Structure formats: structure tokens, C-alpha cells
Write a protein that binds this ligand. Structure first.
Ligand SMILES: [Mg+2]
Ligand SMILES: [Mg+2]
Ligand SMILES: [Mg+2]
Ligand SMILES: [Mg+2]
Ligand SMILES: [Mg+2]
Ligand SMILES: [Mg+2]
Ligand SMILES: [Mg+2]
Ligand SMILES: [Mg+2]
Ligand SMILES: [Mg+2]
Ligand SMILES: [Mg+2]
Ligand SMILES: [Mg+2]
Ligand SMILES: [Mg+2]
Ligand SMILES: [Mg+2]
Ligand SMILES: [Mg+2]
Ligand SMILES: [Mg+2]
Ligand SMILES: [Mg+2]
Ligand SMILES: [Mg+2]
Ligand SMILES: [Mg+2]
Ligand SMILES: [Mg+2]
Ligand SMILES: [Mg+2]
Lengths: 98, 95, 60, 290, 128, 283
RNA sequence: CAAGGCAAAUAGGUACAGCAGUGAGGAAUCUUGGUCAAUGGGCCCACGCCUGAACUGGUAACUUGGAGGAAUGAGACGUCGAUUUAUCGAGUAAAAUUCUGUAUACAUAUUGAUAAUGACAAUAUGUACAUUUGUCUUGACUAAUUACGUGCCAGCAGUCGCGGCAAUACGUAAGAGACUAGUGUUAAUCAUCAUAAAUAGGUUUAAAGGGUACUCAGA
RNA sequence: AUAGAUGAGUUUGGUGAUGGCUCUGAUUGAACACU
């Protein structure tokens, strides 16, 4: 079952992820079929910016992720959330308005 | 530095001197460093091939600094220019 | 754009250097990445890119 | 913890030259030997003597093990080339003759003739040599703590390191707390003004201010570390020189790292109180550390 | 040798050289533990003269080697568990090992003031 | 009682070294003194390192006002006063920080600036321009052009700089293209064609001004092309920036210096000597 | 399914090369922690359950990286070791003075995570503190000296060697040279070594031309 | 990837060769001794 998931890398207290296309039943950090992109959870801050805003750096190959999604790949809950922001899929969860 | 490369032999003590680009330094042995430092050379490489006799080592190195290929005698002999590419490129001898 | 570049950053004034003005020797990067599999045949035009291919394999 | 290597820093017996404006250092620098005798010393005894001399000034606060790896065998240099020559000549004349150039009469003949021969065609000042040997410790000039010392913002390389470790410096408008940061061409490092005044300002002797509270222009402020009115250090004029690879602004106590130290024909951009004979011996030591 | 003679395997490794401490070099160990079998004296060869204190030791591997006791004065005897390290007495044949003086049972020289690390002597702690 | 060595120190520090206790005269007062080329020497044993002049305070403003008010290209100002383009750009950056301080009502280090500038040699630009501040045509010595080559050619060949560049390598350029202000060569060629100096400067200004337009264009197209790949999707808390890239550029074996991703088959180099764990770039 | 060890008898389980841990062996290598919050996986319509993988805390200088304090300091007109009472040093060294607030401690805030869920910690800012020396070497190779004791004895040594009564080599004392939270030693690997030479060796007298050349294969 | 190629002690009454051994450089999932 092809899955678009995150392979955790980095050091202690410094998580760095790797968006990959691997088989479901395989080690988390094994060499995948491809590497779609990376993901950094800790938000950064613009160098010369004092407004206080924060952003998250995410490198992603949309063209390559779309093909795999179209042939039956099942992204995890976290990768699904990212693809929703990009506009490829619909949000799986939403904040209750009532 | 010296002109090109020189290889001399003095009774089983062969010395091979090589010219090196500027800023290379005197990456030579302890006896060649003194001769080059006294003659005015600053960039060179050396290698003892067969033997390392202290005396013949210095005799061979002295005969090598005198047996350098004269770039002008090689030109008149062959009837062909031997252009100094580094001189034309920079417009003169960049010491 | 978000905010103008201040005079502190080196990008305040761009002065491109001439060609062949440095010789930085970058080290060898250890490790490899998986080679993505080719999706189309090297030669010829495949059928996957023709019109109506998606509608045939994924009909509503 | 004071290590055994600092017990005699400005000793008048050993006479070491240190990177500081201390008066004891000024005397050891002024009365330093013109050329240490190396005639009888062997090749190792010369390389060691040159290493100990040069290492007492260049990167004195850096472990020997670390510098051995920081030492680079790449000695950069530039070449001046005016456009007037290029416009007229395209380098063909340099290959005249047999490839090296048109030969000129020997010197013992030019003095004999009355008229001087025509001048050779080439760039101006194209026969003077370049001091490559004196750029051995150029990599140390890239450190952030050294650049602060060469800009005259601190009284020594040890004090310029304190400013960085204590969060008093900011490179590119951002705080930098690492004295080993290797500056890049274009970085603008800026030190706090209050530290530059105390570092270069004259000592604050409470006895002088006693007779001051009673008796443009600046008033006397007895609530500041340096002595008011601010006056430069006593013997700072003897060490007042800013290298060419820096562009400083005394007003805001800032400076830009234009480029790396680069050699030129007849000039080097690396402060070193040692002749090319010593810098050449120190360069051969670090090729193989023996 | 012709390229053909090299194709058939004429280049063979050089004959091995014996190690100074085979018992340690063979198994790639820096030191071994052994039970002292005999503490005697060995005489140097032609040039040197004296009585070198040695110890016949039976290593943990099983080898029975002869180690040299450095320093002045030891406190080991029969059935003493001592630590053996590489080395060799250049004038005593068969004495191809040394004994660590800060070892299990072998004590360090108590009256040693220089090179205490080589003889396992704690600092005197005069002021402390 | 003071030792003999100290007694000699204070002896020299009172008669010969007393000239350095205070800086009375304007200009350098170093130990080596003036050299043969009229440049002080901070270290007598090292005659090659000389104290070079620094841009005077009033001179820094001239460069700033010319580039900002008159809007002249940096290349023209660099060639007018013989100041390197890398220094002209730094003078403006540092001057802009002064305007911020003066605008923010911050106290400058005026007492430290005036005293220090009296210890260094200066070069006042404008009318009294005795010598050029520095060399603006210095070329970097490429490693390929440092080799001793004697190419055998015809006895009557016109070996030019172009031919020499090809002899060092195929991808090498001559020094005519490695200059920071290449518009000067075109300017000097006009003086050989008996062109009026008034017109020779006009062409030079238009040349530099035209080149800066191109450079400014490439920069704009670059930054615009780097933001087209970033799709900003604001959220409740932060702003997610999705940078696009090609997942197929990993080389023929997966080993590419510019590849994106945490490479596999490599352990941590943390236990290696000379391993850098300090920021190497502060944007 | 068979055999042996432990356990079990009419029973018919177990094998920690799963995590932590114990014993043994050895020169030598750790906690019988917390949590499923993050990433991954299994089951499930869904919610949700489970996860010794995993993430985190702990132990060890094993390694790497960083901190580990800078400036002033001349008449305490003191002290110490040499000796030429003034020469040669300890020595700008110390004390003392003027500053900083580094590792760390504490507080606050943000973040790791979002539909919600935080075991544990990072980052930023504020305030506060100036905290050890150790070790090898000192004949030449190899940077660095004398004195006394010892007398081929005691010992030193990587190599050459030193020691037999005026030893720069041993053991002490002082000085000197150097590395430093490390320093030495042992073991090992590469290079040194063109010291198995494909690149690139050599064989009269130094290791090494076969007793001979017709000849299949092979160059 | 264009800067990258280096020696030293030791056989002899002595010289020049041959040929080993050892030191000089870098390192370890290292151990030990003094810290
Ligand atoms: Mg022997
Ligand atoms: Mg001692
Ligand atoms: Mg000893
Ligand atoms: Mg276990
Ligand atoms: Mg088992
Ligand atoms: Mg045991
Ligand atoms: Mg989980
Ligand atoms: Mg999950
Ligand atoms: Mg579910
Ligand atoms: Mg802090
Ligand atoms: Mg959960
Ligand atoms: Mg010596
Ligand atoms: Mg001998
Ligand atoms: Mg002794
Ligand atoms: Mg450390
Ligand atoms: Mg025969
Ligand atoms: Mg036969
Ligand atoms: Mg025979
Ligand atoms: Mg004979
Ligand atoms: Mg030989």
C-alpha cells in the first residue's frame, strides 16, 4: 500500500522530516521509492522582521505528489493535512464552528 | 622557481626538481630548502628517487639548478616560438 | 514581498562579482537518495499523455 | 583557570610579541631583534623557532590542534591591470622574439650609451614580487574576534573575544555569540559603543576624578566605566592601523568585511611583525607539523 | 616481470614480520591479565650488565610469557594477578613484555617523583 | 626594587617611547616610520604591510551623496574616485545606519571617532586628490593561470590574451572580462580614436548606467522567479510556505550536491574532528 | 519431530542473538525510567484500543564542538631562589583597582501540534555568580640545563645507546621546552615503503637467470 | 577539484651502494596509568 508519509530525521530535540513515497509495512526510515520533499515542524522567523509572525519551511514536489495520489497512494493524517493547505485534497478535520 | 623540470644523477643519488606555481612554497627537503632559500627560489618541489646520500644529494641538486632547459635555445633549435602564456595573459612578468 | 531589506543585510546593494573570481572547494557530501522511477518509456510518446486516457481508467 | 602557557605573557626576558596594546608589549615590539640567528640552527630548530614566534601573535588564543586544520596552503593574490594598456596592446608584444619578449641590452651597456633605449611595453609596476610567504596566518583574519581587534574596537584579541561571547556583537544586524564565526565577504559586524569606549578608553583612576567634581565638548560623568572625558588609551597610537580588507565607521562602531586578505605585488594585507624569512619557516612547519 | 607473469599471480604479499608482543598483537588487545608463575632475574647480553627483574606470567589466553618489571622495587610473588602490556627488554632475550605498575596487584613506586604516570604513583598530596 | 629589565623598559618608555603616550600630530605615528613609498609601517621587521589611508569622514559623505542624490551608478563613482565597488557599497550601508541613529536620536561615538581618525592616514576626495584611494582593476589570480606553460607556436604568430586564456583551459576568460568595471577599456579605446574627453565621459556614464539596469533586471527576474515557487498558505497561527522543486534532480546515482532531502546511508558526523557546528551564514 | 540443559509426570512448558537487568568470560562497553505528546505500524464503519519500534530522561572525557575572563597594575620602595650585595631571575607575576555576566541557576514567553491530545525539552529575553590545573619530555633522532647522589650496581631505552668514583642519558632538586581537561603509554590501521613496483622495480661481482633448446598451449 | 607529490636515526677503519628496522604525519566503537 503506497503511502505518502514523513520519515523522521535530525538529532535529539531537533526534529527534521522527509516526505517520501514508501510501502506501508516497512521501516519508517528505510530507503523509500522516492523523496517528495521535507518538512520542519518548528516554525522559523524572518530575519529582519519584528512583527512577531512565524512561518514553516516546506519543500514539496506537487507535480510528483499529484501523480501518486491519483494512482491510489494513501497519505497519512499529517501529510493529508499539508496537502489540504496546498489545495490538492479536502481537509480531513475541521474546527467545529458551533 | 626553476624552468620546467630537471632530473640529475650523481652516483646513485637521483634528484628530481619540479617548478611549481606561485604561493606553493619550498615544499622540499631540509638541504634543498637552504639552497633554494639562498639562491632566491621560493616555489619548488623535490624528490629523491634512488638514494639520499647527504653529499651527492647536494651535488645533484646544484647540477640540476645549472642544467635547466633554456626556453630560448629550445626555440631557435626547433624554429618555433615558445610563448610564455603567463606573461601574455597578465601583460608582463608577474613576480 | 514582506518588508524592505535594511542596510544591515549584505543584499542592500547587489554588486555581482566578475566571472571566475573565487575557487571555493566544496566537500564531498556523503549519503545518497533513491532514484525516482521513470514513469514514461524513454522513447516514443506514451498513451498515458493522450487525451481521454484518464477518463478511460477513472470513469465517473 | 589560568593555564601554564599564560604565566609569562608579556615577559621581558622571552620578549614575545602579543596581539594587544599593552605597554610591556610595545617595548618588546620596538626592541625586537631584526633577524634571529638561524645560521647554525638545523631545519627543525628553525621551523620550531619560527612557529613559536609567529604563534605568540597570530591566533594566540586558539588551540594548536585547531589551527593546524585551519592552516590553508592556498595563499590568494591579485594582479593590477590598467585599462589603458589593454586598449592599445593585446599581449602580442609580450610573445615577441622567441616567446618570452624582445631582449634588451645588458645594464653595463645602457650606462655607457648617451641616449636611453625605448621603454618596454607592459603594465606599470609589473616587475616587483609579491609576498606570498607573509600570508600564512590570513585564515585567522577571518575570525569574528580578530576582525574586531583589527578594526581597533578592542585593546587585544582576548578582549575582542569577550565582547562576542558576552553578546555584545551583532553581525548583519543579528546577535552573534560565537567568536569563531568565519566572516563572509559583505558581512557587517557591529560592536556596542559602550564596550568600544571602555576597551580603548583610558583607565578610570578614582584619584584623578577626586579633583574633577570640584573644578564638541563633553562633560564629566562619574557613572561610567571609562574615564570622563573620554580620551584614547595611552599607547594606542603605535598600534593604530586598519587593514584594507575592512571598511569601518567609527561613529557607530561598525565595519564591513569587504573581502578576504589578499596579497598584491609588493604588499600584504595581513598584520605580522615578522620578516618573510620567519613566515616562510612557519609555513613549512604546518605543511607536515614536523 | 612481464605483464603475463603478473596476470598469473607473481605479486604475492611480503613475508610477515614478527611483532614485539605477539600475545597482544595476535588478538589485537592492548593488555592482558596473567597470574605470576615465577619472579626471578634475567641477565642482559654482551654489552649490558646487571640483574633485570622479570616475571614468568601465564596469560588469560593460556600463553606463558616473560614480562619485565619496571621501576625500583616490586611487591609481587608467586600467584600474583598482574596486568601485562606490550614492550620489550632490548637486552634480555625472551623478555618481550612489560608489567603495569598501577595494575591489580603490582603496586606503584611510592618514592617516585618524576614520570609517576609510567609507574602508577599517586601524587604525594603534601599540602592536601 | 625594579629589576634591570624593567628599568630598561621604563627608560625606553620615557625618552624614545614617550612619543606614543599621546597623539599630538595628525597622521600615523607608527614605529617603522615613513617608508620609501610614503606609507607608514606599523611593524619595522615587516616592510610589506603598510598602513594604508582610510576614507576621510567628509569623503564618505561625498560618495554617499553622489550615489543617492545624483543617483549615479556605483561603477561610475568607483572609477571617478578610484574606490573599489565593494568599498563604495559598504560606505553607503554604513552611512545609512548613521541616518537611522541620527533619526532615532542615538548618541554617536564622536569622541572615539575624531581621536582615532587622527592616528590613521586619510585621503580627502574632491579637489585635492593626490593619489587614487586604491586599485579598482585588481584581478583575482585563478589557479589555472598560475601554471608555467611554454606553448610551441609558429615563429610569426600573434599570440594574444585570448589565445593565452585558451592555453590555460577551455572555459577560462581573459583578464579583459574579469574586471569589475569593464566599461573603462571601452572608455580608453575612445581616447585612442581622438575622441573629445567630454564625449568619452558621456559614453562611459551611459555604459555603466546601462549595465546596472541589466543587473537590476536580472535580480528582479530572479527574486520574482524564486517567489513564484513559494505558495504561501496562511493559517490560524503561522504561514506555511510550500516551496516547489523537481524531485528528479538527484543525479544518476542519487548523489547530488543540490539535492533536497536528508540523505540516506550516512551516519552522524558529530564525532568527527574539525566538524563545524556554528552558523556558517547569517542572512 | 528428535536430542541435551532448566522445569514439569502423566505432564507434554521454556531457550532475552526483542528492551532494561543479573551472573560468567574479558584489557574493556550503560538504566531493571517516563510516555504513546510527536513520527511509523497493526486492529477498527466510527470513536477508540495496542506498540521495549519510536520519541524522551539517566550512566561513561569514549569522541567531537563550545565555555572555562578581560583591561589596568613603577618607586609592597616587601618576599623568594641564585649569587657577582649588586648583578641574574621569579615578575606585571601577585595583591589591588576598573569592567563584563560566559557555562550554569532562576523567572517569564513562545515553540515542538494540532480537529484535539505535551512524556520531555529546545529556543528567545530578563536578572544573578569570576569557578581546578594536570601531564609528558629534557645525549642525538627531538623543541628544552646545571647540581648532587649512585658507580656496568640500582635503573633508563621507540632506534643508536647510557651506567665501571669529577654521568648534560640512571635516581633526586631546581630550571627549561611543549600539549592541556585532558596528557602519556600499550595495541591496531593507513602513509613512511618504487618495501611484491598494473601505473612503476630488479637479477656480472650485493636476495635473485632455469644445465640445454627442439616444441603443444599461450604471449 | 589546478596544488598534490618532501624526509630523519642506524651496518663500515672510512667512502659510495644495496637492503631491512625504527622515528617523523593522521586516526580508533579503543584499554590502561596519572589526573
Ligand atoms: Mg639492541
Ligand atoms: Mg622536574
Ligand atoms: Mg625517564
Ligand atoms: Mg538484552
Ligand atoms: Mg541465548
Ligand atoms: Mg571477569
Ligand atoms: Mg504514537
Ligand atoms: Mg501516528
Ligand atoms: Mg480512524
Ligand atoms: Mg546566559
Ligand atoms: Mg494519541
Ligand atoms: Mg636540542
Ligand atoms: Mg652502531
Ligand atoms: Mg636524569
Ligand atoms: Mg573539549
Ligand atoms: Mg646460465
Ligand atoms: Mg632442472
Ligand atoms: Mg643451478
Ligand atoms: Mg672492511
Ligand atoms: Mg637502499
Amino acid at each position: 500500500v503506497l503511502k505518502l508519509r514523513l520519515a523522521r530525521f535530525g538529532r535529539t530535540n531537533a526534529p527534521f522530516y522527509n516526505i517520501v513515497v514508501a510501502h506501508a509495512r516497512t521501516a519508517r526510515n528505510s530507503k523509500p521509492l522516492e523523496v517528495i520533499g521535507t518538512y520542519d515542524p518548528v516554525p522559523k522567523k524572518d530575519t529582519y522582521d519584528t512583527t512577531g509572525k512565524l512561518h514553516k519551511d516546506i519543500k514539496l514536489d506537487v507535480t510528483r505528489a499529484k501523480y501518486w495520489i491519483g494512482v491510489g497512494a494513501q497519505p497519512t493524517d499529517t501529510v493529508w493535512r499539508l496537502l489540504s493547505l496546498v489545495g490538492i485534497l479536502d481537509p480531513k478535520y475541521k474546527k467545529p464552528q458551533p | 622557481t626553476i624552468y620546467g623540470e630537471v632530473t640529475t644523477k650523481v652516483s646513485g643519488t637521483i634528484v628530481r626538481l619540479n617548478s611549481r606555481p606561485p604561493g606553493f612554497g619550498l615544499r622540499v627537503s631540509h638541504r634543498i630548502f637552504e639552497m633554494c632559500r639562498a639562491a632566491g627560489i621560493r616555489d619548488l618541489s623535490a624528490k629523491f628517487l634512488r638514494s639520499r646520500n647527504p653529499m651527492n644529494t647536494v651535488k645533484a641538486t646544484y647540477q640540476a639548478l645549472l642544467s635547466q632547459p633554456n626556453p630560448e635555445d629550445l626555440a631557435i633549435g626547433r624554429g618555433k616560438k615558445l610563448v610564455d602564456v603567463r606573461k601574455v595573459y597578465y601583460g608582463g612578468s608577474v613576480y | 514581498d514582506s518588508v524592505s531589506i535594511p542596510p544591515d543585510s549584505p543584499n542592500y546593494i547587489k554588486v555581482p562579482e566578475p566571472p571566475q573570481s573565487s575557487e571555493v572547494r566544496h566537500p564531498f557530501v556523503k549519503g545518497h537518495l533513491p532514484i525516482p522511477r521513470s514513469i514514461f518509456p524513454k522513447k516514443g510518446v506514451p498513451e498515458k499523455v493522450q487525451s481521454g486516457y484518464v477518463n478511460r481508467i477513472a470513469p465517473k | 583557570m589560568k593555564i601554564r602557557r599564560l604565566f609569562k605573557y608579556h615577559s621581558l626576558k622571552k620578549k614575545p610579541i602579543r596581539p594587544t596594546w599593552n605597554k610591556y608589549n610595545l617595548y618588546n615590539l620596538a626592541t625586537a631583534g631584526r633577524e634571529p640567528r638561524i645560521s647554525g640552527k638545523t631545519f627543525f630548530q628553525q621551523k620550531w623557532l619560527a612557529k613559536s614566534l609567529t604563534r605568540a601573535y597570530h591566533g594566540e588564543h586558539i588551540k594548536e590542534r585547531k589551527w593546524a586544520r585551519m592552516f590553508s596552503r592556498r595563499l590568494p593574490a591579485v594582479v593590477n591591470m590598467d585599462p589603458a594598456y589593454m586598449a592599445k596592446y593585446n599581449g602580442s608584444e609580450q610573445a615577441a622574439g622567441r616567446g618570452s619578449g624582445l631582449s634588451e641590452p645588458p645594464a653595463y651597456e645602457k650606462t655607457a650609451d648617451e641616449k636611453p633605449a625605448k621603454q618596454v611595453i607592459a603594465n606599470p609596476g609589473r616587475k616587483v614580487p609579491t609576498p606570498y610567504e607573509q600570508m600564512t596566518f590570513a585564515p585567522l583574519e577571518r575570525r569574528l574576534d580578530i576582525a574586531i581587534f583589527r578594526a581597533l574596537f578592542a585593546s587585544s584579541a582576548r578582549q575582542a573575544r569577550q565582547m562576542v561571547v558576552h553578546g555584545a556583537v551583532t553581525v548583519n544586524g543579528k546577535k552573534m555569540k560565537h567568536p569563531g564565526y568565519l566572516l563572509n565577504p559583505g558581512d557587517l559586524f557591529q560592536v556596542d559603543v559602550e564596550r568600544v569606549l571602555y576597551a580603548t578608553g583610558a583607565p578610570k583612576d578614582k584619584k584623578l576624578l577626586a579633583a574633577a567634581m570640584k573644578a564638541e565638548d563633553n562633560e564629566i560623568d562619574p557613572s561610567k566605566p571609562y574615564m570622563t572625558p573620554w580620551r584614547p588609551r595611552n599607547y594606542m597610537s603605535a598600534f593604530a592601523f586598519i587593514p584594507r580588507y575592512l571598511e569601518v565607521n567609527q561613529n557607530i562602531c561598525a565595519a564591513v568585511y569587504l573581502r578576504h586578505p589578499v596579497a598584491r605585488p609588493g604588499e600584504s594585507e595581513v598584520p605580522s611583525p615578522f620578516s618573510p624569512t620567519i613566515n616562510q619557516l612557519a609555513f613549512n612547519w604546518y605543511l607536515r607539523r614536523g | 616481470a612481464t605483464l603475463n607473469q603478473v596476470m598469473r599471480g607473481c605479486r604475492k604479499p611480503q613475508r610477515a614480520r614478527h611483532a614485539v608482543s605477539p600475545a597482544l598483537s595476535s588478538i589485537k588487545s592492548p593488555a592482558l591479565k596473567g597470574v605470576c608463575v615465577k619472579v626471578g632475574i634475567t641477565r642482559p647480553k654482551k654489552p649490558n650488565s646487571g640483574e633485570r627483574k622479570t616475571a614468568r606470567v601465564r596469560l588469560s589466553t593460556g600463553k606463558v610469557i616473560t614480562a619485565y618489571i619496571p621501576g625500583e622495587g616490586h611487591n609481587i610473588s608467586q600467584h600474583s594477578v598482574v596486568l601485562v602490556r606490550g614492550g620489550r627488554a632490548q637486552d634480555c632475550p625472551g623478555v618481550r613484555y612489560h608489567l603495569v605498575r598501577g595494575a591489580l596487584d603490582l603496586a606503584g613506586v611510592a618514592t617516585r617523583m618524576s614520570s609517576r604516570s609510567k609507574y602508577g604513583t599517586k601524587k604525594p598530596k603534601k599540602a592536601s | 626594587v625594579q629589576s634591570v629589565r624593567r628599568q630598561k623598559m621604563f627608560s625606553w618608555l620615557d625618552k624614545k617611547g614617550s612619543a606614543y603616550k599621546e597623539h599630538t600630530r595628525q597622521g600615523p605615528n607608527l614605529l617603522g616610520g615613513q617608508g620609501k613609498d610614503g606609507l607608514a609601517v606599523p611593524f619595522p621587521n615587516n616592510p610589506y604591510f603598510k598602513s594604508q589611508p582610510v576614507l576621510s569622514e567628509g569623503s564618505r559623505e561625498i560618495i554617499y551623496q553622489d550615489v543617492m542624490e545624483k543617483g549615479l551608478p556605483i561603477k561610475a563613482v568607483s572609477a571617478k574616485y578610484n574606490v573599489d565597488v565593494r568599498r563604495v557599497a559598504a560606505v553607503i550601508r554604513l552611512k545609512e545606519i548613521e541616518k537611522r541613529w541620527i533619526k532615532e536620536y542615538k548618541p554617536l561615538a564622536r569622541p572615539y571617532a575624531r581621536a582615532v581618525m587622527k592616528m590613521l592616514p586619510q585621503t580627502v576626495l574632491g579637489g585635492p586628490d593626490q593619489k587614487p584611494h586604491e586599485s579598482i582593476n585588481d584581478v583575482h589570480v585563478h589557479s589555472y593561470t598560475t601554471q608555467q606553460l611554454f606553448v610551441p607556436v609558429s615563429e610569426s604568430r600573434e599570440f594574444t590574451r585570448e589565445d593565452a586564456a585558451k592555453a590555460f583551459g577551455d572555459h577560462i576568460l581573459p583578464v579583459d572580462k574579469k574586471l569589475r568595471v569593464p566599461e573603462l577599456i571601452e572608455f580608453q579605446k575612445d581616447l585612442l580614436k581622438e575622441v573629445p574627453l567630454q564625449e568619452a565621459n558621456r559614453k562611459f556614464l551611459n555604459a555603466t548606467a546601462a549595465s546596472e539596469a541589466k543587473i537590476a533586471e536580472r535580480e528582479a527576474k530572479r527574486r520574482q522567479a524564486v517567489e513564484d515557487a513559494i505558495t504561501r498558505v496562511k493559517t490560524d497561527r503561522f504561514e506555511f510556505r510550500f516551496q516547489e522543486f523537481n524531485a528528479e534532480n538527484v543525479g544518476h546515482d542519487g548523489r547530488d550536491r543540490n539535492a533536497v532531502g536528508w540523505r540516506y546511508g550516512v551516519p552522524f558526523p558529530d564525532r568527527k574532528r574539525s566538524q563545524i557546528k556554528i552558523p556558517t551564514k547569517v542572512e
